[PDB]
Scaffold this motif. Structure first.
Motif, PDB file in Angstrom:
ATOM      1  N   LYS A  88     -23.025   6.108  -5.727  1.00  9.50           N
ATOM      2  CA  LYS A  88     -22.337   5.967  -7.004  1.00  9.50           C
ATOM      3  C   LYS A  88     -23.267   6.163  -8.194  1.00  9.50           C
ATOM      4  CE  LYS A  88     -19.055   3.138  -7.719  1.00  9.50           C
ATOM      5  NZ  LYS A  88     -18.215   1.936  -7.953  1.00  9.50           N
ATOM      6  N   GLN A  89     -22.659   6.405  -9.357  1.00  9.49           N
ATOM      7  CA  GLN A  89     -23.406   6.757 -10.559  1.00  9.49           C
ATOM      8  C   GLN A  89     -24.434   5.700 -10.939  1.00  9.49           C
ATOM      9  OE1 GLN A  89     -23.453   5.101 -13.463  1.00  9.49           O
ATOM     10  NE2 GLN A  89     -21.605   3.832 -13.539  1.00  9.49           N
ATOM     11  N   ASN A  90     -24.249   4.460 -10.490  1.00  9.90           N
ATOM     12  CA  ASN A  90     -25.139   3.349 -10.799  1.00  9.90           C
ATOM     13  C   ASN A  90     -26.054   2.973  -9.636  1.00  9.90           C
ATOM     14  OD1 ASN A  90     -23.201   2.293  -9.129  1.00  9.90           O
ATOM     15  ND2 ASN A  90     -22.268   0.971 -10.685  1.00  9.90           N
ATOM     16  N   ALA A  91     -26.200   3.855  -8.649  1.00  8.26           N
ATOM     17  CA  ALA A  91     -27.159   3.641  -7.575  1.00  8.26           C
ATOM     18  C   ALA A  91     -28.582   3.562  -8.118  1.00  8.26           C
ATOM     19  CB  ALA A  91     -27.056   4.764  -6.548  1.00  8.26           C
ATOM     20  N   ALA A  92     -29.435   2.856  -7.382  1.00  3.48           N
ATOM     21  CA  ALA A  92     -30.797   2.576  -7.812  1.00  3.48           C
ATOM     22  C   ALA A  92     -31.726   3.760  -7.577  1.00  3.48           C
ATOM     23  CB  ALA A  92     -31.342   1.352  -7.080  1.00  3.48           C
ATOM     24  N   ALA A  93     -32.716   3.887  -8.460  1.00  3.18           N
ATOM     25  CA  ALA A  93     -33.760   4.891  -8.294  1.00  3.18           C
ATOM     26  C   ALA A  93     -34.613   4.663  -7.053  1.00  3.18           C
ATOM     27  CB  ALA A  93     -34.654   4.915  -9.530  1.00  3.18           C
ATOM     28  N   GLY A  94     -34.775   3.417  -6.621  1.00  3.10           N
ATOM     29  CA  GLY A  94     -35.595   3.144  -5.451  1.00  3.10           C
ATOM     30  C   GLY A  94     -35.003   3.555  -4.119  1.00  3.10           C
ATOM     31  N   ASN A  95     -33.760   4.023  -4.084  1.00  4.89           N
ATOM     32  CA  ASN A  95     -33.144   4.437  -2.828  1.00  4.89           C
ATOM     33  C   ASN A  95     -33.485   5.860  -2.404  1.00  4.89           C
ATOM     34  OD1 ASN A  95     -32.010   1.941  -2.913  1.00  4.89           O
ATOM     35  ND2 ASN A  95     -29.935   2.635  -3.398  1.00  4.89           N
ATOM     36  N   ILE A  96     -34.088   6.667  -3.274  1.00  7.56           N
ATOM     37  CA  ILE A  96     -34.377   8.056  -2.935  1.00  7.56           C
ATOM     38  C   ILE A  96     -35.462   8.117  -1.871  1.00  7.56           C
ATOM     39  CG2 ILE A  96     -35.173  10.246  -3.839  1.00  7.56           C
ATOM     40  CD1 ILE A  96     -34.027   9.430  -6.550  1.00  7.56           C
ATOM     41  N   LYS A  97     -35.315   9.038  -0.911  1.00  5.29           N
ATOM     42  CA  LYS A  97     -36.400   9.299   0.031  1.00  5.29           C
ATOM     43  C   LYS A  97     -36.737  10.787   0.071  1.00  5.29           C
ATOM     44  CE  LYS A  97     -39.327   8.288   3.267  1.00  5.29           C
ATOM     45  NZ  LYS A  97     -40.522   7.461   2.975  1.00  5.29           N
ATOM     46  N   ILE A  98     -38.037  11.098   0.126  1.00  4.57           N
ATOM     47  CA  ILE A  98     -38.554  12.467   0.193  1.00  4.57           C
ATOM     48  C   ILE A  98     -39.428  12.652   1.430  1.00  4.57           C
ATOM     49  CG2 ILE A  98     -39.572  14.334  -1.117  1.00  4.57           C
ATOM     50  CD1 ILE A  98     -39.479  12.391  -3.568  1.00  4.57           C
ATOM     51  N   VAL A  99     -39.158  13.699   2.209  1.00  4.05           N
ATOM     52  CA  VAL A  99     -39.928  14.018   3.412  1.00  4.05           C
ATOM     53  C   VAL A  99     -40.389  15.473   3.358  1.00  4.05           C
ATOM     54  CG1 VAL A  99     -40.006  13.893   5.908  1.00  4.05           C
ATOM     55  CG2 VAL A  99     -38.549  12.373   4.635  1.00  4.05           C
ATOM     56  N   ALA A 100     -41.704  15.676   3.356  1.00  3.32           N
ATOM     57  CA  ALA A 100     -42.297  17.009   3.404  1.00  3.32           C
ATOM     58  C   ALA A 100     -42.093  17.657   4.768  1.00  3.32           C
ATOM     59  CB  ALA A 100     -43.785  16.931   3.092  1.00  3.32           C
ATOM     60  N   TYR A 101     -41.788  18.958   4.774  1.00  2.00           N
ATOM     61  CA  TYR A 101     -41.561  19.733   5.993  1.00  2.00           C
ATOM     62  C   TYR A 101     -42.344  21.040   5.906  1.00  2.00           C
ATOM     63  CZ  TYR A 101     -39.003  21.261  10.111  1.00  2.00           C
ATOM     64  OH  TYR A 101     -38.701  21.684  11.380  1.00  2.00           O
ATOM     65  N   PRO A 102     -43.641  21.001   6.225  1.00  2.00           N
ATOM     66  CA  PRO A 102     -44.474  22.211   6.133  1.00  2.00           C
ATOM     67  C   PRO A 102     -44.052  23.356   7.031  1.00  2.00           C
ATOM     68  CG  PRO A 102     -45.806  20.239   6.393  1.00  2.00           C
ATOM     69  CD  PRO A 102     -44.412  19.853   6.711  1.00  2.00           C
ATOM     70  N   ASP A 103     -43.375  23.089   8.146  1.00  3.03           N
ATOM     71  CA  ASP A 103     -42.965  24.168   9.043  1.00  3.03           C
ATOM     72  C   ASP A 103     -42.333  25.329   8.288  1.00  3.03           C
ATOM     73  OD1 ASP A 103     -42.573  25.301  11.694  1.00  3.03           O
ATOM     74  OD2 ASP A 103     -40.436  24.924  11.358  1.00  3.03           O
ATOM     75  N   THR A 104     -41.551  25.035   7.255  1.00  2.64           N
ATOM     76  CA  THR A 104     -40.893  26.053   6.444  1.00  2.64           C
ATOM     77  C   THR A 104     -41.288  25.926   4.982  1.00  2.64           C
ATOM     78  OG1 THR A 104     -38.880  24.843   5.872  1.00  2.64           O
ATOM     79  CG2 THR A 104     -38.976  25.890   8.035  1.00  2.64           C
ATOM     80  N   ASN A 105     -42.339  25.169   4.697  1.00  3.73           N
ATOM     81  CA  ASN A 105     -42.783  24.890   3.342  1.00  3.73           C
ATOM     82  C   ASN A 105     -41.659  24.380   2.447  1.00  3.73           C
ATOM     83  OD1 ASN A 105     -45.230  25.086   1.626  1.00  3.73           O
ATOM     84  ND2 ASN A 105     -43.956  26.486   0.433  1.00  3.73           N
ATOM     85  N   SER A 106     -40.940  23.362   2.921  1.00  5.90           N
ATOM     86  CA  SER A 106     -39.758  22.881   2.219  1.00  5.90           C
ATOM     87  C   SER A 106     -39.772  21.355   2.165  1.00  5.90           C
ATOM     88  CB  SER A 106     -38.477  23.398   2.880  1.00  5.90           C
ATOM     89  OG  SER A 106     -38.275  22.794   4.137  1.00  5.90           O
ATOM     90  N   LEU A 107     -38.863  20.793   1.372  1.00  5.44           N
ATOM     91  CA  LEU A 107     -38.710  19.354   1.221  1.00  5.44           C
ATOM     92  C   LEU A 107     -37.303  18.935   1.612  1.00  5.44           C
ATOM     93  CD1 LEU A 107     -40.336  19.138  -2.253  1.00  5.44           C
ATOM     94  CD2 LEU A 107     -41.466  19.079  -0.039  1.00  5.44           C
ATOM     95  N   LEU A 108     -37.198  17.756   2.213  1.00  3.85           N
ATOM     96  CA  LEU A 108     -35.930  17.100   2.493  1.00  3.85           C
ATOM     97  C   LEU A 108     -35.793  15.897   1.575  1.00  3.85           C
ATOM     98  CD1 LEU A 108     -36.215  17.186   6.363  1.00  3.85           C
ATOM     99  CD2 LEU A 108     -35.169  18.875   4.890  1.00  3.85           C
ATOM    100  N   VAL A 109     -34.665  15.788   0.878  1.00  2.00           N
ATOM    101  CA  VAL A 109     -34.438  14.703  -0.067  1.00  2.00           C
ATOM    102  C   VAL A 109     -33.128  14.030   0.302  1.00  2.00           C
ATOM    103  CG1 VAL A 109     -34.317  14.034  -2.469  1.00  2.00           C
ATOM    104  CG2 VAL A 109     -35.655  16.002  -1.805  1.00  2.00           C
ATOM    105  N   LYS A 110     -33.138  12.703   0.319  1.00  2.00           N
ATOM    106  CA  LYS A 110     -31.966  11.889   0.616  1.00  2.00           C
ATOM    107  C   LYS A 110     -31.632  10.972  -0.547  1.00  2.00           C
ATOM    108  CE  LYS A 110     -32.059   8.061   2.671  1.00  2.00           C
ATOM    109  NZ  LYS A 110     -31.220   7.290   1.719  1.00  2.00           N
ATOM    110  N   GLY A 111     -30.396  11.076  -1.028  1.00  2.44           N
ATOM    111  CA  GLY A 111     -29.934  10.217  -2.105  1.00  2.44           C
ATOM    112  C   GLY A 111     -28.500  10.521  -2.484  1.00  2.44           C
ATOM    113  N   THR A 112     -28.123  10.119  -3.696  1.00  2.00           N
ATOM    114  CA  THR A 112     -26.853  10.517  -4.290  1.00  2.00           C
ATOM    115  C   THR A 112     -26.951  11.901  -4.922  1.00  2.00           C
ATOM    116  OG1 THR A 112     -27.260   9.593  -6.471  1.00  2.00           O
ATOM    117  CG2 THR A 112     -26.406   8.109  -4.786  1.00  2.00           C
ATOM    118  N   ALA A 113     -25.784  12.469  -5.214  1.00  2.00           N
ATOM    119  CA  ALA A 113     -25.705  13.793  -5.821  1.00  2.00           C
ATOM    120  C   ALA A 113     -26.488  13.900  -7.125  1.00  2.00           C
ATOM    121  CB  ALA A 113     -24.242  14.153  -6.053  1.00  2.00           C
ATOM    122  N   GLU A 114     -26.298  12.953  -8.039  1.00  2.00           N
ATOM    123  CA  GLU A 114     -27.031  13.006  -9.300  1.00  2.00           C
ATOM    124  C   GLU A 114     -28.529  12.836  -9.100  1.00  2.00           C
ATOM    125  OE1 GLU A 114     -24.925  10.090 -11.762  1.00  2.00           O
ATOM    126  OE2 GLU A 114     -23.786  11.805 -12.532  1.00  2.00           O
TER     127      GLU A 114
END
Lengths: 78, 102, 49, 78, 78, 79, 78, 79
Positions: free
Chosen positions: C1-27
């Motif tokens: 939801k629009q009021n979700a917390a900033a601390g919930n985001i997670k970032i995982v580096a994926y060098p196999d394809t030189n890309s990033l995986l990000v988990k969170g809300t749409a915004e």
């Protein structure tokens, strides 16, 4: 996010403080295992193994001291 | 006495790799100065060798970026004491480079 | 939801394809994307004699 | 910069103090091996080998003593 | 530091009681590492390293004792 | 002022001030011998200085070690 | 002297138990230092130094034993 | 299948995979030597191999002991 308490934050400060030691130790070991008689490999392994030993010791001694400080406060809620 | 000397050496290694995959090439080889006879001097020799270590990246502009370690040269040989071989195998240096280029 | 917390985001580096995986809300994903593209730029080359 | 401890520094002091001994001791041997019967070669090599010996010994004993001074303090945290 | 406790003070008494040993061992090492085979330098370094050891050791045991003397007192407040 | 000096330093320096100038005498004897190695009186002179120097350095360092071991055993009983 | 406890008494009984060893050892030290190559002086020193070592070790363990007995009794006042 | 092995076993085994053949070379060198125990070409070889074997074993055991003491000192803090 994996939940982390306070103790595992204090513990992690050491892990990120010694950036690369963890791997440097095994690299030095594989060279030494490739040629035990080389004194230049020996004298390089001694310093790393010693650094590792001290790092682990300080780490766990600190975690224990904090747990004792917290248990002594929680004992006073009653 | 008057003396003139000119020398030239060109070498080129080729290595195949895949995008984002680290790779290494390592080579060493020896050459023998054919100064010949039975009443001969000992057959002198020189040894040359090279490292390449690399990691390639594709950029959407159609550019390739590489992290590069390069080591090259020939083995220091005081034992090649001979004067008679003024026709020495050419003394290159020894060189190390590490950098990134695009 | 629009009021979700900033601390919930997670970032995982994926060098196999030189890309990033990000988990969170749409915004959150959107903001992360904007920051990423505000950060990476093609470095200049320098030659020293 | 590369990660290095305090024992690494104490160790590297010696390596940077003996500017080139590690190479000289090798080249001296390479020459000697070519003609073991030359007394001048023998005389030189003897002194070089002896210096390399003492260098490695002092280098190791010092690292040991600083490891012990550290461990003694760490023990008292608790 | 601005704030200094009692244990801090007792620790600092040693650091000011040995005038500059902390420097004398560093520069004695700098001299010895430059010429590991000079007996005059080895005989100096042995003494300064031993003195540094006994100083660091007794400082820590004393602080440990004073901590326990009064950790035992504040236990009786309740 | 004068540099600070512990107890072990003092037990060591009692030798360096006891053997008045042996550390100079040995270098003089070597500089004379290297001039003409085949003089019997020079070889006979150098043998004694070298032996005395050896013994002096041994007695010095062994005594410093013994005191460092008598001290550490007391410091350990503070706990 | 002005004030002394039981542990001070136990300790002092060694300091007076050996009459003059405290000086004899420093005396022999400089007799030797004047002439470190005299066998008679060496033999004289080796025994006085051994006796001084054993005197200090025997003194310290006793004081510790008595401290532990007294702490054990005081623990039971509560 | 294969028997269970701990971290200390992985460490001990590293050395053995490092010295590919020393364990055999040390045996055959001895049988060559003992068949003719007066050939300097055999003796100079055996001296080398036996020295290498000594250093190998002696380094292996000390490394294993140091890792034991690190672990026993961590486990001592669980309580």
């Amino acid at each position: 996010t994996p939940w982390s308490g306070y103790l595992d934050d204090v513990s992690a400060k050491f892990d990120t403080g010694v950036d690369n030691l963890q791997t440097q130790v095994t690299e030095a070991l594989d060279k030494l295992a490739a040629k035990p008689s080389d004194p230049a490999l020996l004298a390089a392994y001694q310093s790393k193994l010693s650094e590792y030993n001290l790092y682990r010791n300080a780490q766990s001694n600190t975690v224990k001291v904090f747990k004792d400080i917290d248990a002594a406060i929680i004992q006073n809620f009653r | 006495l008057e003396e003139k000397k000119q020398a030239t050496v060109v070498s080129r290694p080729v290595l195949l790799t895949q995008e984002n995959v680290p790779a290494i090439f390592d080579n060493n080889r020896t050459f023998y100065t054919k100064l010949i006879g039975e009443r001969n001097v000992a057959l002198e020799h020189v040894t040359y060798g090279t490292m390449i270590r690399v990691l390639p990246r594709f950029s959407a502009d159609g550019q390739i970026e590489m992290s590069l370690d390069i080591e090259d040269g020939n083995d220091k040989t005081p034992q090649s004491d001979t004067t008679t071989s003024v026709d020495a195998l050419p003394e290159v240096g020894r060189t190390l480079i590490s950098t990134i280029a695009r | 939801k629009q009021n979700a917390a900033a601390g919930n985001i997670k970032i995982v580096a994926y060098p196999d394809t030189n890309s990033l995986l990000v988990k969170g809300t749409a915004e959150q994903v959107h903001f992360i994307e904007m920051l990423v593209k505000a950060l990476d730029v093609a470095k200049r080359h320098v030659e020293l004699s």
